[PDB]
């Protein structure tokens, strides 16, 4: 019967929204993980420089 159609039409949009709102909750997690990697990959590299310099200095000394 019609109306039960209208109620089978909402419980459908209200999964579309809940599908859209948990396909961003990953996108946030992806870009946050792809951030942290790069926020620690540059840091890894920095310590080498700050250490490559410090030991050379200590060789010369």
């Amino acid at each position: 019967k019609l109306e039960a159609i209208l109620s089978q039409e909402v419980e459908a949009e209200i999964q579309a929204l809940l599908q859209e709102a948990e396909a961003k909750a990953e996108a946030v997690k992806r870009e946050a993980e792809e951030k942290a990697k790069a926020l620690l990959q540059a840091r890894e590299r920095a310590l080498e420089a700050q250490y490559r310099a410090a030991l050379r200095r200590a060789e010369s000394a």
């Binding site: 620690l40 840091r43 890894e44 310590l47 700050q50 250490y51 410090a54 030991l55 200590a58 060789e59 000394a61």
Partner: protein, 52 residues
């Protein structure tokens, strides 16, 4: 990560220098002893050039 990087260099910028101290003085001793036996030859070379 820094916590295990700063203490890395310190445990090397001690071992490395501390090794140099063993190298430096052993090479100080190594320049003296070569000089101190073949020495009168130098004194000779000098004296022989002052009394002319």
């Amino acid at each position: 990560l820094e916590a295990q990087y700063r203490e890395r260099e310190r445990a090397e910028t001690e071992a490395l220098l501390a090794r140099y101290r063993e190298r430096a003085e052993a090479e100080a001793k190594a320049v003296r002893e070569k000089a101190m036996a073949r020495l009168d030859e130098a004194v000779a070379l000098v004296l022989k050039e002052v009394l002319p």
